C-alpha cells in the first residue's frame, strides 16, 4: 500500500537487487544473433515532438563478447529508451541488454549459427513499485472514477517489478559436463567453415561479487573514513573441444 502524496523534485532511492537466473550455451561456425528493442527509426505516423514516447524497433544484431544478457526488464537499449539514466541499475542503464534470436537463427537456410543450444531461464517478481515523474499516457477517464476531496491527483500508474533469480543449484547446472553433437538442428552438422568456431556462454549461477576493503589509516577507534570499499568479480572458464577431420 502507500503512499499519500509526496511527488517532488527528486524521489530517487538507493536500491539494490538480484537479477534473473540465466544459463545458456551455443556453438556454430558463425557468431550468434541477438534481438533487442531500441529507439526505432522515426517515424511511424507523423509528425511532431517533443518528450513523447520514442518509436520501438526490434533490432537484430551480432552478440559480441561483453554484451549484457537480459535481466528482469527485457532486452532493450536502456541508453536510448530511458533518458534519465536512473530507471534500471547502473550496470545496464548505459548499455543494451540483448536476447538470443532463437527463431531467426533456427530458420536460416544453412544454419551456420546454431549447431546446437541449451538454455535455462528462471525468475519471479520480488517487489513492486511505481516510477516518479509525469505519466506520459494517463489512465482513461472511463477506467477510473475520479475523487476525492483530497487525492484528486491520479497516482503514478507506471508499474515495474524487481526480478529475482531464485535458487541456484548444482542439479540445474548446464556446464562441467560434455555435450556430443550427434545431430544438428540445421543443415550444417557441426562443420567449422573457415577453421573457426564461435562458442557463446551465459552463466549467472557464479555471479558472486566479492567485496574488498583496504585501509587508508587505522584510527584508535573504528571510523568509516579509514577504509575504502571495492567491488570485484571473477570468471573462470576451461573450454575443451574434440574435433573430427573431414574431407570434401
Amino acid at each position, epitope marked *: 500500500s502507500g503512499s499519500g502524496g509526496n*511527488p*517532488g*523534485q527528486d524521489n530517487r532511492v538507493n536500491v539494490g537487487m538480484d537479477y534473473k537466473q540465466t544459463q545458456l550455451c551455443m556453438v556454430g561456425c558463425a557468431p550468434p544473433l541477438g534481438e533487442h528493442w531500441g529507439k526505432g527509426k522515426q517515424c511511424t505516423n507523423t509528425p511532431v515532438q517533443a518528450g513523447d514516447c520514442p518509436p520501438l524497433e526490434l533490432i537484430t544484431s551480432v552478440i559480441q563478447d561483453g554484451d549484457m544478457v537480459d535481466t528482469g526488464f527485457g532486452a532493450m537499449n536502456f541508453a536510448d529508451l530511458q533518458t534519465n539514466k536512473s530507471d534500471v541499475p547502473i550496470d545496464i542503464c548505459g548499455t543494451t541488454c540483448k536476447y538470443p534470436d532463437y527463431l531467426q537463427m533456427a530458420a536460416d537456410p544453412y544454419g551456420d549459427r546454431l549447431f546446437f543450444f541449451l538454455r535455462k531461464e528462471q525468475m519471479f517478481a520480488r517487489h513492486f513499485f511505481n516510477r516518479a515523474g*509525469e*505519466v*506520459g*499516457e*494517463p489512465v482513461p*477517464d472511463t477506467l477510473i472514477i*475520479k475523487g476525492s476531496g483530497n487525492r*484528486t*491527483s*491520479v497516482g503514478s500508474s507506471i508499474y515495474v517489478n524487481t526480478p529475482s533469480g531464485s535458487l541456484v543449484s548444482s542439479e540445474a547446472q548446464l556446464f562441467n559436463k560434455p555435450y556430443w553433437l550427434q545431430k544438428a538442428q540445421g543443415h550444417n552438422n557441426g562443420i567449422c567453415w573457415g577453421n573457426q568456431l564461435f562458442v557463446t556462454v551465459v552463466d549467472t549461477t557464479r555471479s558472486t561479487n566479492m567485496t574488498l576493503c583496504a585501509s587508508v589509516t587505522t584510527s584508535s577507534t573504528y571510523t568509516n573514513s579509514d577504509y575504502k570499499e571495492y567491488m570485484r568479480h571473477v570468471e573462470e572458464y576451461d573450454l575443451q573441444f574434440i574435433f573430427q577431420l573431414c574431407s570434401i
Partner: antibody
Amino acid sequence: EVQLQQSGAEVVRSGASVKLSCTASGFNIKDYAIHWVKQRPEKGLEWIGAIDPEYGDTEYVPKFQGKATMTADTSSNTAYLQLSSLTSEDTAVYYCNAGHDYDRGRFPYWGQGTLVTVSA
Amino acid sequence: DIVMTQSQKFMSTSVGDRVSITCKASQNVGTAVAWYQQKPGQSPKLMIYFASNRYTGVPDRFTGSGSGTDFTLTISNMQSEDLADYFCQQYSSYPLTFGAGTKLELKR
C-alpha cells in the same frame, strides 16, 4: 509555439455573469494541470483553482467557491472560467496558466490576460 | 492558509550590483517555492521553481535558495532588463498563495 489565447476584455454591469475562455491547454491524452490566477491592483496575485483536462478534476479556493465556476471541454479547447454575481471586487485581470504537463507551482506558460471591469 | 511575506515592497540597487529578495513562509513548505518575474503590461514569466531550479530560459544570473520557511532570490550582476516585479509562490498545500509585490529600481 506554446502560447495561450483568452477571450478578451469585457465591461459588465453589476449582477451579471461573465465567461472567460482559454485555448491550446487541455488535449486528449495530454494531460496538463490548468490554473487560474486573479490579479487585483491591491491584493497582488490570488490563485483561483486547478483543473485537469483528460479528467475534469476540480479544486477551488474557499474564498472563490460559489463565485467562480470552472469547466473543461476535452475536445479542442479549454479552459472556461465563469463568475456569477459580479461586484466591484471582481474588477481584475485573470490569467489562464498551465505548468507543463502537470503540477501546481509551475506556471511557465501564462495566458495573455483578460481584463474584466464590473461597474455601471 | 500559508502566508507569503516578502520583506520590502520596493528595492534599490544599481547596474552590475547584487540583489537579494527574501520570502518568509508562515509554515514549513520544504522546497515547494517558485519565483516569478512580471514586467508592466505583461504576463508573469516563471523564473525559479522548486526553490533553486532555473526554468528553461532563465540565465545563470538568477539563483534561488532557501528551504522550510526562509527563501531568497539572488541576482548576481544586473542588467536593465531585470527591472520588474518579483513574486514568490507556495505550493506545499492548498490554497496556493503568493507574496506581496517587490519593485526593483536602479540607482543609475
